[PDB]
Coordinates of C-alpha atoms and ligand atoms in Angstrom, one line a residue:
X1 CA 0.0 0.0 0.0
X2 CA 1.0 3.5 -0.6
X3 CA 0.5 6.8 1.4
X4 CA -0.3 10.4 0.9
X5 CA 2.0 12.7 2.0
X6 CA 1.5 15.2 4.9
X7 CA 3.5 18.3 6.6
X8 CA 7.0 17.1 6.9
X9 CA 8.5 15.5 9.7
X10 CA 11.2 17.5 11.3
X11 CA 12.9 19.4 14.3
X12 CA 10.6 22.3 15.5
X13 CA 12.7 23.4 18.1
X14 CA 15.9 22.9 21.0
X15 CA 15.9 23.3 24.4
X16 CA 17.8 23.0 27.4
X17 CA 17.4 20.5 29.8
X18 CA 18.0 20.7 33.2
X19 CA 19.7 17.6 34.1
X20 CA 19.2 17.4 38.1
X21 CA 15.5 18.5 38.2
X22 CA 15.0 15.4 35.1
X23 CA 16.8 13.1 36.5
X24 CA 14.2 13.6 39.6
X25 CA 11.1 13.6 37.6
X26 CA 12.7 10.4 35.8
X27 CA 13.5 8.7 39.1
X28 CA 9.3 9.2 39.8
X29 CA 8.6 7.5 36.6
X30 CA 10.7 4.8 37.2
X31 CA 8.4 3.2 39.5
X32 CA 5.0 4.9 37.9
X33 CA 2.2 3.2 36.9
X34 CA 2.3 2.9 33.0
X35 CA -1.2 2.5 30.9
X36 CA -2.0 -0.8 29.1
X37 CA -4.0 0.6 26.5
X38 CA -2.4 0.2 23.4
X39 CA -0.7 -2.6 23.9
X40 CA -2.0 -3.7 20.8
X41 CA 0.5 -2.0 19.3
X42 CA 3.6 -3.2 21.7
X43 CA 6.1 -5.4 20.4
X44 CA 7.5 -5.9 23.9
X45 CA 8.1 -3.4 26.8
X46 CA 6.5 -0.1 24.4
X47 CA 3.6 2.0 27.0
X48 CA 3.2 5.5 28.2
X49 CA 1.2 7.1 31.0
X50 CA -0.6 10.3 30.8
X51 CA 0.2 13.6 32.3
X52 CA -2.5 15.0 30.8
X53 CA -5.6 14.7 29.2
X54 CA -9.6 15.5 28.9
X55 CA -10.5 15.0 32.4
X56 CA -7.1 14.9 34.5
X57 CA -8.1 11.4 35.8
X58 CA -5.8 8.7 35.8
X59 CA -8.4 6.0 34.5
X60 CA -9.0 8.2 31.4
X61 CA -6.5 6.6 29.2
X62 CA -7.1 6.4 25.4
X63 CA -7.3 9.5 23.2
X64 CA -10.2 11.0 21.0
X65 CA -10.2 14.3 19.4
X66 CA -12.0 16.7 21.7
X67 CA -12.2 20.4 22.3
X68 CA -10.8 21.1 25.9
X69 CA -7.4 22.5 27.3
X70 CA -6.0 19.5 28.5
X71 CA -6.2 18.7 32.7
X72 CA -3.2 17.4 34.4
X73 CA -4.0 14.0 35.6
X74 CA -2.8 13.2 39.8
X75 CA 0.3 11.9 38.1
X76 CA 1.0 15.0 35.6
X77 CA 0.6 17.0 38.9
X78 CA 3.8 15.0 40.8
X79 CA 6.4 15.7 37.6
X80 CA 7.1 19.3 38.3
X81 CA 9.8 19.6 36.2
X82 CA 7.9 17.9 32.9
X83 CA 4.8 19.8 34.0
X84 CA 7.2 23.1 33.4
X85 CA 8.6 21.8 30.2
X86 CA 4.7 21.4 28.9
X87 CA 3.6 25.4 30.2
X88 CA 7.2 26.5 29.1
X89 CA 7.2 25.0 25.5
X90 CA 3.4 24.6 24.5
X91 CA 0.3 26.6 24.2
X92 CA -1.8 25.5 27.3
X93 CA -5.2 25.7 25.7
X94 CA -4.0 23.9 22.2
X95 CA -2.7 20.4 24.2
X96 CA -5.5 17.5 23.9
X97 CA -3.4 15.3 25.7
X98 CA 0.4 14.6 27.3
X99 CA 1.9 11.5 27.4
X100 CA 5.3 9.8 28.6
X101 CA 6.3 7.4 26.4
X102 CA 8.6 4.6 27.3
X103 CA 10.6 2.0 25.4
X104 CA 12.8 -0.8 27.2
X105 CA 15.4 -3.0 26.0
X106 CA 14.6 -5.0 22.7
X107 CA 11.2 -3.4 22.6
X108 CA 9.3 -1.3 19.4
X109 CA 5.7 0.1 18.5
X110 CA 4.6 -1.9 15.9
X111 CA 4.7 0.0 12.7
X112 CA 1.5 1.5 12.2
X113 CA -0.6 5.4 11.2
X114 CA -2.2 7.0 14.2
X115 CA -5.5 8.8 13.5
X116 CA -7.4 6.1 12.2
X117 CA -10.0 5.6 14.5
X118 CA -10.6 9.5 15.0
X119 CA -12.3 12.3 13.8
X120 CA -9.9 14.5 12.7
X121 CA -6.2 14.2 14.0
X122 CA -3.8 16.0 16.1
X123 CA -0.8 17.4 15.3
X124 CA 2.1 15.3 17.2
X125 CA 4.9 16.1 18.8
X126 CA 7.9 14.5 21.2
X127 CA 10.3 15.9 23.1
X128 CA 13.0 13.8 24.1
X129 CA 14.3 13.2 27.2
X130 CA 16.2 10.5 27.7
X131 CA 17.5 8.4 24.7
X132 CA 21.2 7.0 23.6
X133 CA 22.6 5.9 19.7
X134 CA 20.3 2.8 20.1
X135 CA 17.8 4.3 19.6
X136 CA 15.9 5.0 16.6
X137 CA 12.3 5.9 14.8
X138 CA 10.9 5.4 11.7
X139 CA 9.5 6.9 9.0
X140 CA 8.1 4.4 5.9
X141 CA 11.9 3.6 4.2
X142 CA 13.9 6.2 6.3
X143 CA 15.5 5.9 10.0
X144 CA 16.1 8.5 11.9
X145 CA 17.3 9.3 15.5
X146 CA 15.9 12.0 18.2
X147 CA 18.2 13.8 20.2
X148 CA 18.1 14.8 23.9
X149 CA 16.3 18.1 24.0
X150 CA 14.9 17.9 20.5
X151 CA 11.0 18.8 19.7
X152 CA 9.8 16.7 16.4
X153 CA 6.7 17.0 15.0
X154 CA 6.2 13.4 13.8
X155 CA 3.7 12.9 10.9
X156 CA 1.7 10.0 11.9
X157 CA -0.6 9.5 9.6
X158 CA 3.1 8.4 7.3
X159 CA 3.6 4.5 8.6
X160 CA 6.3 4.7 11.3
X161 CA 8.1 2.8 14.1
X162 CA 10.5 3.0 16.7
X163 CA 12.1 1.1 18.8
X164 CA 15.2 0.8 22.0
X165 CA 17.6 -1.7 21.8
X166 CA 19.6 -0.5 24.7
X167 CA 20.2 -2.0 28.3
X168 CA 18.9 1.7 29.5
X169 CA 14.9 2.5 28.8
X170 CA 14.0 5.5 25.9
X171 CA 11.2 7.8 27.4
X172 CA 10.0 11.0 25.3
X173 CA 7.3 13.5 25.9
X174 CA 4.7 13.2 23.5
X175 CA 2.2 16.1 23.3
X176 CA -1.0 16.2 21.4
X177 CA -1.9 19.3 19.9
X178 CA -5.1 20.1 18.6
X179 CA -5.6 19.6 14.9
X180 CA -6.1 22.6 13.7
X181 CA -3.3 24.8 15.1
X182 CA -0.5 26.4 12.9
X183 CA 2.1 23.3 12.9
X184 CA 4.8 26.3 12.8
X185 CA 3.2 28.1 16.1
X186 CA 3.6 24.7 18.0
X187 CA 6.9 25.1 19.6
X188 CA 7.2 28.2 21.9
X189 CA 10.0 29.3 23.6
X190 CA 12.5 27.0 21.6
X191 CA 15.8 27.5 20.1
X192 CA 15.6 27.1 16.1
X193 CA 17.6 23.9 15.2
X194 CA 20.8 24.7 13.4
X195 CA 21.2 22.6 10.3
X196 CA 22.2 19.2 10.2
X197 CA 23.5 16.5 8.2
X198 CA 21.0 13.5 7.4
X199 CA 21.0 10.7 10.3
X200 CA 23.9 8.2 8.9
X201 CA 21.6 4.9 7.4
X202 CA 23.9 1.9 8.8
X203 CA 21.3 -0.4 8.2
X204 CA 21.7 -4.0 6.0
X205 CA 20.8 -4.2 2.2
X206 CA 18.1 -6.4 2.0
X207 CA 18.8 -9.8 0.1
X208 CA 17.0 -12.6 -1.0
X209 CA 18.7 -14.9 1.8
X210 CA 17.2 -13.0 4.3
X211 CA 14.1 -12.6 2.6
X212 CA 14.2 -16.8 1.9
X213 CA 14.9 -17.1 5.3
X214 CA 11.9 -15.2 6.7
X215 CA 9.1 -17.1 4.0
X216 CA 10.4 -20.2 5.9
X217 CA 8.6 -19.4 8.7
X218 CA 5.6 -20.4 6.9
X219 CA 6.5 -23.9 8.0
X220 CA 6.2 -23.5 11.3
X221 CA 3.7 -20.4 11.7
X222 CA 0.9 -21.3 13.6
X223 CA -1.7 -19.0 16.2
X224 CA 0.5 -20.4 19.4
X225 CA 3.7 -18.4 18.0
X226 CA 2.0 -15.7 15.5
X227 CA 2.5 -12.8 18.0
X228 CA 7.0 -13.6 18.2
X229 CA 6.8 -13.9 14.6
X230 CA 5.0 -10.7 13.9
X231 CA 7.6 -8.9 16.8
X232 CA 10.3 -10.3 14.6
X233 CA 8.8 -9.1 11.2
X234 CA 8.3 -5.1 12.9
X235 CA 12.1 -5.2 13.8
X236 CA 13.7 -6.3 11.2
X237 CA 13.7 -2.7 9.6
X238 CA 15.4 -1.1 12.5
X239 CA 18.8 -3.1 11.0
X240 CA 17.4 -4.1 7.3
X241 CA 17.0 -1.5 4.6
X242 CA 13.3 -1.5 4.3
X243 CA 10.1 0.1 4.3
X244 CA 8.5 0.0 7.9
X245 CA 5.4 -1.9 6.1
X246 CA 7.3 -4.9 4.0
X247 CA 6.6 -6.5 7.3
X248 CA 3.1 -7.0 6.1
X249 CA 3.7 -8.3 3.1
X250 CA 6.2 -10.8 4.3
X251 CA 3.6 -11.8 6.6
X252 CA 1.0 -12.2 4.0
X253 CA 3.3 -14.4 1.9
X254 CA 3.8 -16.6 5.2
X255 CA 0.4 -17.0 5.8
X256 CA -0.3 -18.3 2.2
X257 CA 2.5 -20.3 1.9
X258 CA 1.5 -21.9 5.4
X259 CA -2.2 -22.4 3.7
X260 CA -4.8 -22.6 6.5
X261 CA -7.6 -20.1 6.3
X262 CA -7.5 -18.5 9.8
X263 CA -3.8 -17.2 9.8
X264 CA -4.3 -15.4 6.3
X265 CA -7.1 -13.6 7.3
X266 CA -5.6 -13.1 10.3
X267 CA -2.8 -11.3 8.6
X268 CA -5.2 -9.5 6.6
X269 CA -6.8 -8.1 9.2
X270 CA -3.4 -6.8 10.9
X271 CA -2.7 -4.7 7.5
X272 CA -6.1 -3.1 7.9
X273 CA -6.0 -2.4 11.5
X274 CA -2.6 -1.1 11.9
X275 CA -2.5 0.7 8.8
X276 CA -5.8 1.6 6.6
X277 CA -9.0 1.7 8.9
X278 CA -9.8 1.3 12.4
X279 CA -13.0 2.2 14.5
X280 CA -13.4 4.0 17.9
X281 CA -12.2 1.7 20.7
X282 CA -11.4 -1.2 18.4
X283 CA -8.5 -3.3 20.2
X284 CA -6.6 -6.5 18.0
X285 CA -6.0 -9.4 19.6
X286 CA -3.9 -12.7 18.5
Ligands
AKG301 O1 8.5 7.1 19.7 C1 7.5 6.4 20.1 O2 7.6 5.7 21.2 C2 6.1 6.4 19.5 C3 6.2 7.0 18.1 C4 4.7 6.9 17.7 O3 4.2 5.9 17.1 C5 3.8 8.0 17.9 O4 4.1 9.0 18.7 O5 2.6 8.0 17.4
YCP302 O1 -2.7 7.7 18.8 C1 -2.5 7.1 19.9 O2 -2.5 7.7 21.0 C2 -2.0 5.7 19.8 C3 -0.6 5.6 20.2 C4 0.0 4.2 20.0 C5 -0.2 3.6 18.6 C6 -1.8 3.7 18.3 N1 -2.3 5.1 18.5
CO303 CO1 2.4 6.5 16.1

């Protein structure tokens, strides 16, 4: 499948980080209570927790387009130092929601589009806060790392991914902004970024022994192991030259080499959901 382009991808904005008051609100999150929902999308240890969002309670914890300045929920209220970065950075009354989002060791978001099940979008931006060279994001055929201190808006209504393959946890601040704001307003208070040179792309070519090697899973593919080999398939283009969606393909080509009815439509279904439509509240399982 192929996708229409949107506003690009890019820096919107530096800023300084203050190391000691971080490393406190970091310590806090450490042993916080990190939101389940979407796990649907985990390929491993990927989950946020929100800081804020329509109601500032902590059992509101899936997102819908809605008209309110975001509330700080009881655990957005405890982060004093994030909850600074948000007023400092970001136009109170255009936030929808405020996330943390965490990746552990070996772990990835599936690659996917957001927005599907809404009506309308947001614009979507991270600010990274604690990251090393093992980490990276996606963006359909390009990889990409986010600095320390960097503001992205991430267009994800492109296919993306991203994953941590690090001993030491990823966590960004992802802010949702109201659809309709000026994407170059967003970023208040920010130092412009100075040019840069393209991420350097160390990733493998792609060859058909690896690609051989993968189709032979369709001997052994079977709804006991599905959800490994589908984990396997989203991080193979974190170290592979490919586009973030081959994985479905591959998958699809499993499935009908395998030949049983479930596990195609199965795989079917996965394409849809993650990438092409999905309705309001609409969870996949395996
Ligand atoms: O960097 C991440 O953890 C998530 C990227 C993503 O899929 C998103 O923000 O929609
Ligand atoms: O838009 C969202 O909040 C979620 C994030 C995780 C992937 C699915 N969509
Ligand atoms: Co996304």
């Amino acid at each position: 499948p192929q996708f229409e382009k949107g506003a690009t991808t890019r820096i919107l904005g530096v800023v300084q980080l203050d190391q000691r008051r971080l490393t406190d609100d970091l310590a806090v999150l450490a042993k916080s209570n990190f939101s389940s929902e979407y796990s649907d999308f985990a390929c491993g240890r990927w989950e946020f927790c929100m800081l804020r969002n329509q109601s500032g309670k902590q059992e509101e914890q899936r997102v819908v387009v809605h008209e309110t300045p975001a509330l700080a929920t009881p655990l957005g209220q405890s982060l004093p130092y994030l909850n600074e970065l948000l007023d400092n950075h970001f136009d109170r009354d255009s936030i929808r929601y405020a996330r943390i989002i965490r990746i552990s060791e070996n772990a990835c978001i599936i690659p996917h589009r957001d927005y599907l099940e809404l009506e309308g979008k947001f614009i979507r931006v991270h600010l990274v806060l604690d990251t090393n060279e093992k980490c990276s994001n996606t963006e359909e055929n390009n990889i990409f790392h986010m600095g320390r201190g960097e503001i992205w808006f991430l267009d994800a209504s492109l296919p993306h991914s991203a994953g941590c393959f690090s001993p030491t946890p990823r966590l960004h601040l992802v802010v949702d902004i109201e659809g309709t704001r000026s994407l170059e307003e967003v970023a208040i208070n920010v130092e412009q970024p100075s040019a840069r040179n393209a991420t350097v792309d160390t990733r493998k070519e792609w060859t058909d022994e690896t690609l051989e090697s993968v189709l032979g899973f369709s001997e052994i593919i079977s709804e006991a192991n599905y959800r490994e080999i589908v984990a396997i398939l989203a991080k193979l283009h974190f170290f592979h030259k490919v586009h973030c969606v081959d994985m479905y393909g591959w998958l699809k080509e499993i499935c009908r080499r395998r030949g049983e009815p479930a596990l195609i439509e199965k795989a079917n279904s996965l394409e849809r959901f993650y990438l092409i439509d999905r309705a309001a509240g609409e969870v996949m399982t395996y």
